[PDB]
Design a protein that fits this description.
Chain B: One of its GO terms (biological process) is leading strand elongation. The structure is cut from a larger assembly and holds chains A, B, C and D. By secondary structure, chain A is mostly beta strands. In chain A, helix 1 runs antiparallel to helix 2 and helix 3 runs antiparallel to helix 4. The N and C termini of chain A lie far apart (about 50 Å). Chain B has three domains: about 160 residues, no CATH class; about 70 residues, no CATH class; about 100 residues, no CATH class. Chain B contains 15 helices and seven strands. A five-stranded parallel beta sheet of chain B has the order 2-3-4-1-5, sandwiched between helices. The longest helix of chain B has 19 residues. Chain B is globular, with a radius of gyration of 25 Å. Chain B starts with 9 loop residues before the first helix and ends with a helix. In chain C, helix 6 links the parallel strand 3 and strand 4. Chain C is globular, with a radius of gyration of 24 Å. Chain D is of the alpha/beta class. In chain D, the strands form three sheets. A five-stranded parallel beta sheet of chain D has the order 2-3-4-1-5, covered by helices on one side. Chain D has a two-stranded parallel ribbon with strand order 6-7. Chain D has a two-stranded antiparallel ribbon with strand order 8-9. In chain D, strand 3, helix 8 and strand 4 form a beta-alpha-beta unit. Chain D starts with 8 loop residues before the first helix and ends in an 11-residue tail after the last helix. The chains are: A mainly beta, B alpha/beta, C alpha/beta, D alpha/beta. Chains B and C meet through helix 2, helix 4, helix 5, helix 6 and strand 5 of B and helix 10, helix 14 and helix 16 of C. Bound molecules: phosphothiophosphoric acid-adenylate ester (AGS) (3 copies) and magnesium ion (3 copies). One phosphothiophosphoric acid-adenylate ester sits at the interface of chains C and B. The structure holds four DNA strands.
Chain lengths: ~260, ~325, ~325, ~500
DNA sequence: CCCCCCCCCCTTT
DNA sequence: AAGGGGGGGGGG
DNA sequence: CCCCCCGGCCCCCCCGGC
DNA sequence: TTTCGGGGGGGCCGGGGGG
């Protein structure tokens, strides 16, 4: 088996999958000697999910040659639900692969559950996510962003984010009036996790859909803070760090 | 059931329990017996008219194959149960694709009265029959072949149940008279066979009614008079007299004779028409037009009677039709 | 007694494309496709028991070798084939990734596809189009008109014709040799005559004989197999005199147990397919037969009604 | 990774450029012009229509028979103008809920894939836009509830170009798309427009194809290029020469069976040629019954509608047109009785063939010939609906006046209504506005209303038609009548009707 | 720009 | 070989 | 104590010949 | 158009289980 990646507990992989399972259907995983990079595009072709998991997140990682695996997330989640969170989860794939093996092993009861998931043929090529000089680079706690987004979505289906000098406005102008939430760059020493920073280059103003933001903010469980990179005319970048790796959402802004 | 078999109707009390008690179908019985005795039973399609022994034959075959516990080793479905496409997809498929519970053996499925099943279910049954032929066999019973899809008919070996021959009916009547302490005259047996039209149910029901009619069945013999009284059917002499009067007397005399013959025993006009048609079938007419007119007008009168209407007008119509048709002989 | 024996129809089901008789051009085309691969989307149509399912299965087996288990998705009327099934399971199978030799593809076999609803057929279109590089579709049906035009446009039409008497005789003789069956020429003639081009019925009757009487002669065949009643009805309708028609009706149909509804329906069909009689005369006879059929459906299923129908038909043909 | 010789010929030889498309050049040009100028129309809010008239529609509806290049044309147009394609088809659930939760968000959103693919591309302004292609809209079965209406709203309200594709534009289900999209029609391409493509395919695949028999092949597939390419691929496996010798057999084997529509069924059934001896030999009675079954709910209506408008060529010696018409009418009446039997509680659908003979085939054979004029659709459906509406109105009027009269609804129609008119309409034509009160009184005596007044006035026929009479009444009189009625209380016969 | 075949497609709940 | 309307090859 | 999964009615629509 | 019956497919509702 060229590819053998062991997660000490299946909980981590389950949380990672659940983070971006309500917005995409098919994922392409490229596994190389340096780890796993996964890409996904939603049906509407508006949201792009990228995932990076380094070799530090696995107890034992071995990859003789790079491999590509197309997975449907419904089946993957269904199979993952069959393994307890306290078992070690081994992902196994051999040369010329038609399926991937998920092995949930528990040494406490010497119980081994082996599942085989058939791979999907995806012809889409990995979009080149080249570094972009985003105009604004904000970062704020995941809980606060989730609360604000969920509160604003109840009023309007579109949320407008404006970044100006020491001003971050989330307007929700829609059918139910027009509510706004304003936060300022704030720093605390007792609990630095609740600090808000702003590193603009030019003023920014982008409008996004409510459904995409609601799907994106579902990943707050995997990170304590969320980093938002914005540019005058380009997709936003919502980054959630992990113990070893990251989960990024690229959302195409609404027109004007 | 309740109490004992003596409380059952004769049509049910005398239901064959073994293939040796099925009369009048010697070829089919022999073929099926040879098939079972050599382990080469194919899918069966028993096609026949009412009361010929199809259900009895298949039940006896299942009993012979599986013994007394056959009821728990076969899947019997009839028009009284739901047999939709979902039933075929789930219940029949599960039965055909699973092993026996009580004892080892092959699976038998009896789709009695399969002519009452929808076309969709019949189509779904095709691959069920084809795929599980190794361990399952299907038997379907029908009275009307036009209701069965060609695909289903292609998959089944056909056995036709003819109307019961007269000798088989006599043998069954002899067995019944041996069981029930009864005496039957040859004329009574002849009339019973004539009116039965090859149906054993009719024979048994009429015999039971005849026995009930006798005052002292132990020492009273059933005669043709008893049969005609219980069945309320015209006697041959009455039909001959009516026909002779119609064909050889004036209109008033024919009307009077028909009315008197009908009133004497309270006969129905339809039975008289049937008897006269049977009598005239053997007549040798010199002109085809006479037969054509007879058949057409009598069929019209029978159809009119089927919907009710005035009885006297219908009788006069019968008389006039016969007279006009026979006027063409010249 | 409790151990069944495989019927000859299944025991001698052709396992290779070279064992199928009839439709020589189409069979050779299928053999060429198997040899060179690149199977196209196809629809095989015909009438019962001519070798459609056998041909499709043989082609799939020969093409896919040992990859038959994973590369073939078989669905028929006995399986649920609704719109949801087509959208989910068939789409997943088409999107599946499987490693096969250079000239092979995954195969979806929709047997009895005429039973599928219009919505499922509509849903199949873009699935067939987008994934043709890895999946191919083979439909087998009895009535091609049931398949919607868009699906027919995407497939290759293979309309099987009925097996000739020679092909039926050839296959029957091969089976006889492989089974060591005693037979006479007249017995084979009777078997083929009653088969009416249906291989399944021919083999079934051949087994029923021997299984019941040993020697396959015309007599023994006719003691179990009845001559097709459509031919008897045709003889009844074409009889010169009304007396002959009535005699045929009484002896060959009524006294044999055939129901009146069956007789009248067969009369309708035969009159519809009487090419030797003028169309107007056939229309008048059909009107009379329809009157009789309507009377029968009401409950008056008597021999007198059929006799009257024959009398009216003879009146028309005079 | 996919070998060239392992693809279907329809994929290997699929058009790569809009010029490679065969036939329907005008439709392709119309679609290209519509999409090219879509941005300008958006800038003008789709108010100033151009010379072509395509500037007012924000969406296009491509329709035509199968296998002619609609999907290929739409995809090539989308890719030629550097747009990003968002495609949905009948293989995707397209109900109201899913459409609202799906393509609706993308209707006014940018394309992340487009941005990340054309970031380095210069002068690609459309690369970040979406072109929504809704294929197989006609194939929306019960699995897509409300999809047609939601797509119609999308067409009437969208921010990016939207293209819809269907095969049957004349079906009632497609009515909502009547005037909310630019209709682009694709016609069966002729043989001359595809002969070069067939020659190229034959040369590339190493098999002889005679140019003469190409038209016969096109006729066999009825202008389906996909079907003809498939036929060539299937026949070339064993036959290396499609010449005049084998053309007949190939055409007869692959000939299509398209169910005729009601007008075509009526035209063919009434043709006198098929009922001749020879024509009977070619077109048989079974063929006629199958032609009826092609549409068994409209064929009898069409025959009954059009059997009086022909010039028979099958008249028997001495038989006149009127006698044949009478015989056909008698058989149509018998067929109507049979139809009543079929759709009764017994559900005797086994009589469907017999009905076919009594309602369609026999009368047509009696009056078969050449149509004397245009074939007309049945007028029975509209008349039936009108009769049902009038019967409903009569029932309401009867039950409003049921407490004053002594009769059934038929007696009310035949006897009471004339006197009611004489007491409700004539007074207005003699004393003008002085009858108002009197008329109202009459209404109050029978629990009548203004709507009942109009309905009653709408029943009379022949020399008692009130339309002109009502129209000629002075407007002042009618206004006064309405004001007087609306300014007074009236009794109610039935509460909560 | 105009005109003429030549055929196709639509009438239709 | 139904009547009426629309479109693309050829002549003008 | 509250939320989510997925079995069962409930409703609506469309054929029904060879 | 439509007098039953069957079949398919979608929308709710609610029992039960899980956290
Ligand atoms: N060949 C027979 N031999 C003896 N009794 C018979 C025979 N046929 C019918 N009967 C008698 O009539 C009764 C009914 O026979 P069945 O087997 O039910 O006939 P059937 O043909 O299956 O009826 P249908 O086709 O459903 S109306 C039996 O219980 C017997 O008593
Ligand atoms: N051309 C044939 N050659 C040899 N045997 C045949 C042939 N056709 C049919 N049979 C035999 O009959 C049996 C059934 O054949 P099938 O392939 O099932 O016919 P079919 O046309 O597919 O039936 P339908 O259309 O679903 S009713 C086979 O197992 C064969 O034994
Ligand atoms: N005008 C054409 N020219 C060349 N090839 C064509 C043309 N039209 C269809 N084809 C061929 O047929 C194949 C499929 O055609 P499509 O455009 O996808 O079908 P369609 O016209 O959309 O009809 P439906 O409604 O999908 S059946 C193309 O890839 C081509 O290979
Ligand atoms: Mg029975
Ligand atoms: Mg088959
Ligand atoms: Mg298409």
């Amino acid at each position: 088996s060229m590819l053998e990646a062991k997660f000490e507990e299946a909980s981590l992989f389950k949380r990672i999958i659940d983070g971006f399972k309500d917005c995409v259907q098919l994922v392409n995983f490229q596994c190389k000697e340096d780890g796993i990079i996964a890409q996904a595009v939603d049906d509407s072709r508006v949201l792009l999910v990228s995932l990076e998991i380094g070799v530090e997140a696995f107890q034992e990682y071995r990859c003789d040659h790079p491999v590509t695996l197309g997975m449907d997330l419904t089946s993957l989640s269904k199979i993952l639900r069959c393994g307890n969170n306290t078992d070690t989860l081994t992902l196994i794939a051999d040369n010329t692969p038609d399926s991937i093996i998920l092995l949930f092993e528990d040494t406490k009861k010497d119980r081994i559950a082996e599942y085989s998931l058939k791979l999907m043929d995806i012809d889409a090529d990995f979009l080149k996510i080249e570094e972009l000089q985003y105009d604004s680079t904000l970062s704020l706690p995941s809980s606060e962003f989730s609360k604000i987004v969920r509160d604003l979505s109840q009023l309007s289906d579109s949320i407008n984010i404006m970044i100006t000098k020491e001003t971050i406005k989330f307007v929700a102008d829609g059918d139910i009036g027009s509510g706004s939430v304003i936060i300022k760059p704030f720093v605390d020493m007792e609990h630095p996790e609740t600090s808000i920073k702003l590193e603009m280059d030019q003023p920014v103003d982008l409008t996004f859909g409510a459904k995409y933001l609601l799907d994106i903010i579902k990943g707050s469980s995997l990170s304590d803070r969320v980093g938002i990179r914005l540019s005058s005319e380009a997709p936003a970048l919502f980054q959630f760090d992990l113990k070893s790796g990251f989960l990024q959402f690229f959302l195409a802004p609404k027109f004007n | 059931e309740k109490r004992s078999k003596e409380n059952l109707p004769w049509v049910e009390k005398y239901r064959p329990e073994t293939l040796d008690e099925v009369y009048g179908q010697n070829e089919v019985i022999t073929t099926v017996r040879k098939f079972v005795d050599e382990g080469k039973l194919p899918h069966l399609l028993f096609y026949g008219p009412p009361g010929t022994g199809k259900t009895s034959t298949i039940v006896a075959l299942a009993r012979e194959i599986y013994g007394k516990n056959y009821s728990n080793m076969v899947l019997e479905l009839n028009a009284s149960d739901d047999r939709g496409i979902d039933v075929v997809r789930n219940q029949i498929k599960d039965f055909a694709s699973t092993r026996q519970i009580f004892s080892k053996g092959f699976k038998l499925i009896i789709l009695d009265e399969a002519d009452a099943m929808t076309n969709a279910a019949q189509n779904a049954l095709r691959r069920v029959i084809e795929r599980y032929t190794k361990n399952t066999r299907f038997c379907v019973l029908a009275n009307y072949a036009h209701k069965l899809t060609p695909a289903l008919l292609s998959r089944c070996t056909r056995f036709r149940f003819q109307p019961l021959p007269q000798e088989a009916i006599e043998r069954r009547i002899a067995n019944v008279l041996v069981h029930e302490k009864l005496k039957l005259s040859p004329n009574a047996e002849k009339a019973l066979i004539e009116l039965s039209n090859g149906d054993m149910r009719r024979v048994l029901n009429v015999l039971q009614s005849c026995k009930a009619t006798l005052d002292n069945p132990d020492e009273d013999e059933i005669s043709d008079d008893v049969i005609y009284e219980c069945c309320g059917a015209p006697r041959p002499s009455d039909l001959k007299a009516v026909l002779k009067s119609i064909l050889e007397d004036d209109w008033g005399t024919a009307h009077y004779t028909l009315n008197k013959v009908r009133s004497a025993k309270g006969l129905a006009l339809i039975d008289l028409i049937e008897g006269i048609v049977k009598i005239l079938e053997d007549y040798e007419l010199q002109n085809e037009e006479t037969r054509v007119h007879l058949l057409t007008k009598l069929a019209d009168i029978e159809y009119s009677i089927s919907k009710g209407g005035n009885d006297q007008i219908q009788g006069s119509a019968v008389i006039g039709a016969i007279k006009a048709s026979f006027e063409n002989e010249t | 007694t409790l151990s069944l024996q495989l019927p000859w129809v299944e025991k001698y089901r052709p396992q290779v494309l070279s064992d199928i008789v009839g439709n020589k051009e189409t069979i050779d085309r299928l053999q060429q496709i198997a040899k060179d691969g690149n199977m196209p989307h196809m629809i095989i149509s015909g009438m019962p028991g001519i070798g459609k399912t056998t041909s499709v299965h043989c082609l799939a087996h020969e093409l896919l070798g040992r990859s038959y288990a994973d590369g073939v998705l078989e669905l028929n009327a006995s399986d649920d084939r609704g719109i949801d099934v087509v959208r989910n399971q068939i789409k997943h199978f088409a999107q599946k990734k499987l490693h096969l030799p250079p000239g092979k593809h995954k195969i979806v076999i929709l047997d009895e596809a005429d039973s599928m609803t219009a919505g499922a057929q509509q849903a199949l279109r873009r699935t067939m189009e987008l994934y043709s590089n890895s999946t191919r579709f083979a439909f087998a049906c009895n009535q091609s008109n049931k398949i919607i035009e868009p699906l027919q446009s995407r497939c290759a039409i293979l309309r099987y014709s009925k097996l000739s008497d020679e092909d039926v005789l050839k296959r029957l003789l091969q089976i006889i040799k492989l089974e060591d069956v005693k037979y006479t020429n007249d017995g084979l003639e009777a078997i083929i005559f009653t088969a009416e081009g249906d291989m399944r019925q021919a083999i079934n009757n051949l087994q029923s004989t021997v299984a019941g009487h040993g020697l396959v002669n015309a007599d023994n065949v006719f003691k179990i197999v009845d001559s097709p009643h459509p031919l008897i009805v045709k003889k009844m309708l074409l009889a010169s005199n009304l007396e002959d028609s009535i005699q045929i009706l009484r002896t060959d149909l009524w006294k044999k147990g055939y129901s009146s509804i069956d007789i009248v329906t067969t009369s309708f069909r035969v009159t519809k397919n009487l090419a030797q009689v003028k169309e107007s005369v056939r229309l008048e006879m059909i009107k009379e037969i329809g009157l009789t059929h309507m009377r029968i459906l009401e409950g008056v299923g008597t021999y007198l009604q059929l006799a009257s129908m024959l009398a009216k038909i003879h009146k028309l043909n005079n | 990774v996919v070998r060239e010789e392992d693809k279907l010929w329809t994929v290997k030889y699929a058009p790569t450029n809009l010029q490679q498309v065969c036939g329907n050049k005008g439709s392709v040009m119309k679609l290209k012009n519509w999409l090219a100028n879509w941005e300008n129309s958006k800038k003008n809010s789709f108010k100033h229509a151009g010379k072509d008239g395509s500037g007012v529609f924000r969406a296009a509806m491509l329709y035509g028979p199968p296998g002619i290049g609609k999907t290929t044309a739409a995809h090539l147009v989308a890719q030629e103008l550097g747009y990003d394609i968002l495609e949905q088809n009948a293989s995707d659930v397209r109900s109201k809920t899913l459409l609202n939760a799906g393509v609706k968000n993308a209707l006014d959103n940018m394309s992340v894939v487009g941005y990340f693919k054309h970031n380095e591309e210069a002068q690609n302004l459309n690369g970040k836009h979406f072109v929504i292609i809704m294929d197989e809209v006609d194939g929306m079965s019960g699995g897509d509830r409300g999809g047609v209406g939601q797509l119609a709203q999308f067409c009437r309200k969208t921010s990016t170009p939207l293209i819809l594709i269907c095969n049957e534009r004349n079906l009632p289900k497609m009515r909502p798309f009547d005037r909310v999209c630019l209709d682009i029609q694709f016609r069966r391409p002729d043989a001359n427009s595809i002969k070069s493509r067939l020659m190229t395919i034959a040369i590339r695949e190493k098999f002889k194809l005679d140019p003469n028999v190409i038209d016969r092949l096109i006729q066999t597939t009825r202008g389906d290029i996909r079907q003809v390419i498939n036929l060539l691929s299937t026949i070339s496996t064993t036959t290396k020469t499609i010449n005049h010798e084998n053309i007949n057999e190939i055409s007869k084997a692959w000939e299509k069976n398209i169910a005729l529509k009601p007008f075509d069924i009526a035209h063919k059934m009434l043709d006198g040629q098929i009922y001749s001896d020879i024509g009977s030999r070619n077109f048989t009675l079974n063929d006629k019954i199958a032609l009826y079954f092609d549409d068994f709910d409209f064929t009898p209506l069409m025959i009954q509608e059009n059997y009086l408008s022909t010039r028979p060529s099958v008249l028997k010696p001495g038989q006149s047109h009127l006698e044949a018409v009478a015989e056909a009418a008698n058989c149509i009446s018998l067929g109507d009785i049979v139809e009543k039997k079929i759709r009764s509680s017994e559900q005797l659908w086994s009589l469907l063939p017999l009905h076919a003979v009594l309602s369609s085939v026999y009368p047509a054979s009696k009056v078969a010939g050449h149509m004397a004029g245009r074939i007309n659709f049945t007028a029975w459906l509209g008349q039936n609906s009108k009769s049902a509406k009038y019967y409903r109105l009569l029932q309401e009027i009867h039950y409003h006046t049921r407490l004053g009269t002594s009769t059934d609804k038929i007696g009310l129609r035949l006897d009471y209504l004339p006197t009611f008119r004489k007491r409700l309409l004539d007074p207005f034509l003699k004393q003008g506005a002085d009858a108002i009160s009197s008329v109202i009184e009459v209404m109050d005596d029978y629990y009548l209303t203004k709507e009942d007044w109009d309905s009653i006035m709408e029943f009379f026929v022949g020399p008692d038609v009130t339309t002109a009479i009502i129209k000629k009444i002075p407007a002042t009189v009618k206004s006064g009548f309405t004001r007087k009625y609306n300014s007074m209380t009236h009794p109610v016969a039935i509460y909560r009707t």
